[PDB]
Design an enzyme around this catalytic site. Structure first.
Site, PDB file in Angstrom:
ATOM      1  N   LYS A 133       5.222 -10.279   9.142  1.00 58.13           N
ATOM      2  CA  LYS A 133       4.438  -9.302  10.374  1.00 58.13           C
ATOM      3  C   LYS A 133       2.775  -9.953  10.187  1.00 58.13           C
ATOM      4  O   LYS A 133       1.728 -10.097  11.114  1.00 58.13           O
ATOM      5  CB  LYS A 133       4.995  -8.154   9.334  1.00 58.13           C
ATOM      6  CG  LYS A 133       3.889  -7.484  10.214  1.00 58.13           C
ATOM      7  CD  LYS A 133       5.043  -7.156  11.016  1.00 58.13           C
ATOM      8  CE  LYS A 133       4.123  -5.512  12.171  1.00 58.13           C
ATOM      9  NZ  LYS A 133       3.198  -5.753  12.597  1.00 58.13           N
ATOM     10  N   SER A 167       6.901  -1.717  11.426  1.00 57.46           N
ATOM     11  CA  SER A 167       5.415  -0.736  10.848  1.00 57.46           C
ATOM     12  C   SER A 167       5.325   0.542  11.068  1.00 57.46           C
ATOM     13  O   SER A 167       5.967   1.042  11.303  1.00 57.46           O
ATOM     14  CB  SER A 167       4.347  -0.827  11.705  1.00 57.46           C
ATOM     15  OG  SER A 167       3.425  -0.617  11.590  1.00 57.46           O
ATOM     16  N   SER A 168       4.765   1.387   9.577  1.00 55.49           N
ATOM     17  CA  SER A 168       4.676   2.951   9.981  1.00 55.49           C
ATOM     18  C   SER A 168       3.949   3.689  11.364  1.00 55.49           C
ATOM     19  O   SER A 168       4.578   4.598  11.914  1.00 55.49           O
ATOM     20  CB  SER A 168       3.563   3.031   8.785  1.00 55.49           C
ATOM     21  OG  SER A 168       2.868   2.346   8.588  1.00 55.49           O
ATOM     22  N   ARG A 169       3.128   2.865  11.683  1.00 55.42           N
ATOM     23  CA  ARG A 169       2.530   3.021  12.886  1.00 55.42           C
ATOM     24  C   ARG A 169       3.138   3.431  14.329  1.00 55.42           C
ATOM     25  O   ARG A 169       3.011   4.088  15.271  1.00 55.42           O
ATOM     26  CB  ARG A 169       1.475   1.887  13.333  1.00 55.42           C
ATOM     27  CG  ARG A 169       0.122   2.225  12.689  1.00 55.42           C
ATOM     28  CD  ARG A 169      -0.555   0.971  12.696  1.00 55.42           C
ATOM     29  NE  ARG A 169      -1.585   0.705  12.202  1.00 55.42           N
ATOM     30  CZ  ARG A 169      -2.594   0.104  11.828  1.00 55.42           C
ATOM     31  NH1 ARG A 169      -3.132  -0.315  13.142  1.00 55.42           N
ATOM     32  NH2 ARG A 169      -3.683  -0.550  10.850  1.00 55.42           N
ATOM     33  N   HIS A 186       8.642  -3.724   3.809  1.00 57.61           N
ATOM     34  CA  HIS A 186       8.512  -3.615   2.725  1.00 57.61           C
ATOM     35  C   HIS A 186       9.719  -3.625   1.436  1.00 57.61           C
ATOM     36  O   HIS A 186       9.438  -5.579   0.717  1.00 57.61           O
ATOM     37  CB  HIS A 186       8.161  -3.327   1.903  1.00 57.61           C
ATOM     38  CG  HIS A 186       6.804  -1.822   2.911  1.00 57.61           C
ATOM     39  ND1 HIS A 186       6.578  -1.361   3.395  1.00 57.61           N
ATOM     40  CD2 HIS A 186       4.712  -2.968   3.166  1.00 57.61           C
ATOM     41  CE1 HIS A 186       5.372  -0.776   4.010  1.00 57.61           C
ATOM     42  NE2 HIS A 186       4.656  -2.032   4.194  1.00 57.61           N
ATOM     43  N   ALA A 236       4.237   3.862   0.858  1.00 60.07           N
ATOM     44  CA  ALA A 236       5.118   4.529   2.302  1.00 60.07           C
ATOM     45  C   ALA A 236       5.703   3.418   2.827  1.00 60.07           C
ATOM     46  O   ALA A 236       5.705   2.784   3.522  1.00 60.07           O
ATOM     47  CB  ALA A 236       3.571   4.398   3.306  1.00 60.07           C
ATOM     48  N   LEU A 237       6.497   2.882   2.045  1.00 63.82           N
ATOM     49  CA  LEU A 237       7.615   1.504   1.731  1.00 63.82           C
ATOM     50  C   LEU A 237       7.923   2.364   2.721  1.00 63.82           C
ATOM     51  O   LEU A 237       9.279   2.779   3.198  1.00 63.82           O
ATOM     52  CB  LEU A 237       8.069   1.426   0.561  1.00 63.82           C
ATOM     53  CG  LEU A 237       7.212   1.040  -0.134  1.00 63.82           C
ATOM     54  CD1 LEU A 237       7.230   1.286  -1.680  1.00 63.82           C
ATOM     55  CD2 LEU A 237       6.575   0.013  -0.243  1.00 63.82           C
ATOM     56  N   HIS A 238       9.036   1.037   3.727  1.00 67.56           N
ATOM     57  CA  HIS A 238      10.017   0.897   4.854  1.00 67.56           C
ATOM     58  C   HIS A 238      11.251  -0.713   4.093  1.00 67.56           C
ATOM     59  O   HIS A 238      10.617  -1.022   4.051  1.00 67.56           O
ATOM     60  CB  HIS A 238       9.754   1.330   6.273  1.00 67.56           C
ATOM     61  CG  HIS A 238       8.544  -0.020   6.974  1.00 67.56           C
ATOM     62  ND1 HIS A 238       8.246  -0.954   6.395  1.00 67.56           N
ATOM     63  CD2 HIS A 238       7.278   0.117   7.432  1.00 67.56           C
ATOM     64  CE1 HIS A 238       7.182  -2.095   7.139  1.00 67.56           C
ATOM     65  NE2 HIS A 238       6.422  -0.494   7.591  1.00 67.56           N
ATOM     66  N   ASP A 289       8.541   9.507  -3.510  1.00 67.46           N
ATOM     67  CA  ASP A 289       9.439   8.869  -2.530  1.00 67.46           C
ATOM     68  C   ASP A 289       9.271   7.367  -2.467  1.00 67.46           C
ATOM     69  O   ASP A 289      10.423   6.178  -2.502  1.00 67.46           O
ATOM     70  CB  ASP A 289       9.059   9.298  -0.637  1.00 67.46           C
ATOM     71  CG  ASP A 289      10.149   8.369   0.173  1.00 67.46           C
ATOM     72  OD1 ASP A 289      11.589   8.026  -0.112  1.00 67.46           O
ATOM     73  OD2 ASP A 289       9.604   7.351   0.800  1.00 67.46           O
ATOM     74  N   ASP A 290       9.013   6.338  -2.949  1.00 63.48           N
ATOM     75  CA  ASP A 290       8.531   5.465  -2.910  1.00 63.48           C
ATOM     76  C   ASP A 290       8.704   4.601  -4.369  1.00 63.48           C
ATOM     77  O   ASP A 290       9.521   3.819  -4.332  1.00 63.48           O
ATOM     78  CB  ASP A 290       7.114   4.925  -2.988  1.00 63.48           C
ATOM     79  CG  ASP A 290       5.944   5.150  -1.414  1.00 63.48           C
ATOM     80  OD1 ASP A 290       6.637   4.909  -0.335  1.00 63.48           O
ATOM     81  OD2 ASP A 290       4.550   4.986  -1.198  1.00 63.48           O
ATOM     82  N   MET A 300       0.753  -0.771  -0.240  1.00 67.90           N
ATOM     83  CA  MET A 300       0.487  -0.435  -0.124  1.00 67.90           C
ATOM     84  C   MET A 300       1.207   1.212   0.038  1.00 67.90           C
ATOM     85  O   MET A 300       0.677   2.424   0.421  1.00 67.90           O
ATOM     86  CB  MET A 300      -0.886   0.137   1.576  1.00 67.90           C
ATOM     87  CG  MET A 300      -1.589  -1.010   1.146  1.00 67.90           C
ATOM     88  SD  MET A 300      -3.558  -0.999   2.431  1.00 67.90           S
ATOM     89  CE  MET A 300      -2.143  -1.432   3.957  1.00 67.90           C
ATOM     90  N   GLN A 355      12.590   4.603  -3.333  1.00 68.79           N
ATOM     91  CA  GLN A 355      12.668   3.854  -3.218  1.00 68.79           C
ATOM     92  C   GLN A 355      12.784   2.781  -3.731  1.00 68.79           C
ATOM     93  O   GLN A 355      13.946   1.822  -3.378  1.00 68.79           O
ATOM     94  CB  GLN A 355      12.201   3.371  -1.915  1.00 68.79           C
ATOM     95  CG  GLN A 355      12.741   4.059  -1.023  1.00 68.79           C
ATOM     96  CD  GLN A 355      11.845   3.350   0.927  1.00 68.79           C
ATOM     97  OE1 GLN A 355      12.133   2.968   1.231  1.00 68.79           O
ATOM     98  NE2 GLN A 355      10.613   4.586   0.798  1.00 68.79           N
TER      99      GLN A 355
HETATM  100  C1  LIG Z   1      -1.773  -5.232  -0.672  1.00 68.68           C
HETATM  101  C2  LIG Z   1      -2.264  -6.424   0.939  1.00 68.68           C
HETATM  102  C3  LIG Z   1      -0.923  -7.290   0.864  1.00 68.68           C
HETATM  103  C4  LIG Z   1      -2.272  -5.621   2.138  1.00 68.68           C
HETATM  104  N1  LIG Z   1      -3.210  -5.864   3.232  1.00 68.68           N
HETATM  105  C5  LIG Z   1      -1.286  -4.970   2.891  1.00 68.68           C
HETATM  106  O1  LIG Z   1      -0.413  -5.644   4.125  1.00 68.68           O
HETATM  107  N2  LIG Z   1      -0.620  -3.871   2.411  1.00 68.68           N
HETATM  108  S1  LIG Z   1       0.607  -3.162   3.302  1.00 68.68           S
HETATM  109  O2  LIG Z   1       1.746  -1.762   2.870  1.00 68.68           O
HETATM  110  O3  LIG Z   1       1.163  -2.868   4.531  1.00 68.68           O
HETATM  111  O4  LIG Z   1       2.261  -4.656   3.254  1.00 68.68           O
HETATM  112  C6  LIG Z   1       2.647  -5.252   2.036  1.00 68.68           C
HETATM  113  C7  LIG Z   1       3.396  -6.249   2.928  1.00 68.68           C
HETATM  114  O5  LIG Z   1       4.368  -6.101   3.842  1.00 68.68           O
HETATM  115  C8  LIG Z   1       4.456  -6.753   4.656  1.00 68.68           C
HETATM  116  N3  LIG Z   1       5.035  -6.107   6.000  1.00 68.68           N
HETATM  117  C9  LIG Z   1       4.900  -5.224   6.560  1.00 68.68           C
HETATM  118  N4  LIG Z   1       5.576  -4.765   7.298  1.00 68.68           N
HETATM  119  C10 LIG Z   1       6.960  -5.453   7.098  1.00 68.68           C
HETATM  120  C11 LIG Z   1       8.012  -6.398   8.420  1.00 68.68           C
HETATM  121  N5  LIG Z   1       7.697  -5.319   9.211  1.00 68.68           N
HETATM  122  N6  LIG Z   1       8.226  -7.317   7.653  1.00 68.68           N
HETATM  123  C12 LIG Z   1       8.429  -7.990   6.699  1.00 68.68           C
HETATM  124  N7  LIG Z   1       7.135  -7.615   6.279  1.00 68.68           N
HETATM  125  C13 LIG Z   1       6.496  -6.445   6.294  1.00 68.68           C
HETATM  126  C14 LIG Z   1       3.288  -6.728   4.695  1.00 68.68           C
HETATM  127  O6  LIG Z   1       3.006  -8.301   5.804  1.00 68.68           O
HETATM  128  C15 LIG Z   1       2.274  -7.352   3.962  1.00 68.68           C
HETATM  129  O7  LIG Z   1       2.637  -8.787   2.939  1.00 68.68           O
END
Ligand SMILES: CC(C)[C@@H](N)C(=O)NS(=O)(=O)OC[C@H]1O[C@@H](n2cnc3c(N)ncnc32)[C@H](O)[C@@H]1O
Ligand SMILES: CC(C)[C@@H](N)C(=O)NS(=O)(=O)OC[C@H]1O[C@@H](n2cnc3c(N)ncnc32)[C@H](O)[C@@H]1O
EC number: 6.3.2.1
Lengths: 288, 278
Positions: free
Chosen positions: B150, B186-188, B46, B41-43, B78-79, B39, B82
């Protein structure tokens, strides 16, 4: 992969088998046609087969599977006609090269877990008294589409609401398949061919001409407008001995609510004793 | 005609038919199409998915960026930056209208696991996730699709989708990326004040403690995790559950998963870990 003999009927039960064979064929350039059926094949099913066969370089896959999920209540399932010997002979006669005949266990190893939820159209017409019927249909058709991966899939206009819902499925899940509707095949007097027609005795068989009579009358009355088309159909159905109408409805071709006076579909469902019959027809309002 | 594709560059497509055409052309030329749904907002969490996808020989990486209205800032430039720096060749960035041209009509109805755990507060969440993932799978037709552990329940439900609908794709789950103290990225996390961010370590500490307590059995693992969470202030535990690896009931011995969710002020955090009972 499993064996495939060209110009011969190849019967596969395992999804993995027909999947591998289809995948192989697609790489050899042949275009894969899928005709989903529940068996008990008649001339209506064979028109779909022939439409498929007609696509240049086509390989035709006909699936035969009676899907417990689309049946809803009592023993509609146990009552469905199963003539598996005849089915494969007809396919041989038609020069079909693949029949796919999966088991219930192979299609539903986890019972009903992930399923397709159709749009609101599935709650109407045929879906009214059978609110889970089309969820069953779209779930099994999605699975077949994923197993077989055809270029084109064939459905009859006889089951028009099903055809429409399948188009929605293909659109809404971005499926890479062309949906081909094939015109309804009729007996000599106009009766829409169906496996259910065998449940009609000679009286009921005679009264049954009324569905197609009412529809074709409506289609010609329609120059005079929608009310005239509907009233003509209704008159024919009312003149018919022991035909109990379930619904008679005029809709737009996407099965929305009709245009003002455009192109549409007139659909009827009627009971003759215990046997429920369906028919439909293209209707043009204000056009000769 | 197939849309322009420039190898070794980031190619951005917004139209489903465009990325569909390109993905199809590339597979025909001996590439293996890897799909990484996000979604935006990549870190680093991702990017771990990206790096997993990249190391497949012959891979071309497709990263989708799409905010699902069916399942809060954004940085498109920015995404993309990256992804460029990771060497990703395709980003798929559709609009809501391109994804949902007829609104919400046909949808995926998940099995009953969707009503559990994360589906408690959000009972339609996974329906939204499975619908969009099914759509992305049909558009891109990847050989492999990558999800993070995650979101373990999400990952499990995607494996159920792929099994139940006979989808011809491998689902690859990628280990959770964590901060230096074990907090799952997490972005949170950036919303946490210093006290909350300090207390937040208890979720991961609780789970790793449990994983090590589990030589002494299931109850010792659960009690260890609960004690660790009980030692943190302002951590409102929503659930703490040990299940089998497919999220069914925990068997008496063998492999399991321990999952936790908790609220720190307004911010809800999740974590989970592999457990081996005995
Ligand atoms: C599009 C659909 C997949 C949606 N429900 C979603 O999860 N969007 S997302 O941008 O919030 O997450 C993208 C992917 O990154 C993964 N992810 C996030 N944080 C981490 C982490 N710390 N370590 C490993 N993997 C991670 C997450 O589990 C998901 O498979
Ligand atoms: C598998 C799934 C599609 C299931 N719900 C089903 O309809 N099975 S079926 O065996 O009853 O029919 C298979 C196909 O044949 C079509 N069909 C039947 N009778 C005729 C006819 N007289 N003229 C043209 N086409 C016809 C029917 O509409 C369907 O597309």
């Amino acid at each position: 992969i499993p064996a495939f003999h060209p110009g011969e009927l190849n019967v596969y039960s395992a999804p993995g088998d027909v999947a591998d064979v289809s995948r192989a064929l697609r790489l050899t350039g042949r275009r894969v046609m899928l005709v989903p059926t529940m068996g008990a094949l008649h001339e209506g099913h064979l028109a779909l087969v022939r439409a498929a066969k007609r696509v240049p370089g086509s390989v035709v896959v006909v699936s035969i599977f009676v899907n417990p999920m689309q049946f809803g209540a009592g023993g509609d399932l146990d009552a469905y006609p199963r003539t598996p010997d005849d089915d494969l002979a007809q396919l041989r006669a038609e020069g079909v090269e693949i029949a796919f005949t999966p088991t219930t266990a192979a299609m539903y190893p986890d019972g009903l877990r992930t399923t397709v939820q159709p749009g609101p159209l599935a709650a109407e017409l045929e879906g009214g008294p059978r609110p889970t019927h089309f969820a069953g249909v779209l779930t099994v058709v999605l699975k077949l589409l994923q197993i077989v991966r055809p270029d084109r899939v064939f459905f009859g206009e006889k089951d028009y609401q099903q055809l429409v819902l399948i188009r929605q499925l293909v659109a809404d899940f971005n499926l890479d398949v062309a949906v081909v509707g094939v015109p309804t095949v009729r007996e000599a007097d106009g009766l829409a061919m169906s496996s259910r027609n065998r449940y009609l005795d000679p009286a009921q068989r005679a009264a049954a001409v009324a569905l197609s009579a009412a529809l074709t009358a409506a289609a010609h009355a329609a120059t005079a407008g929608a009310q005239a088309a509907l009233d003509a159909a209704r008159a024919v159905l009312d003149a018919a001995p022991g035909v109990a109408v379930d619904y008679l409805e005029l809709r737009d071709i996407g099965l929305g609510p009709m245009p003002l006076n455009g192109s549409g579909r007139l659909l009827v469902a009627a009971r003759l004793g215990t046997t429920r019959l369906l028919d439909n027809i293209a209707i043009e309002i204000g056009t000769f």
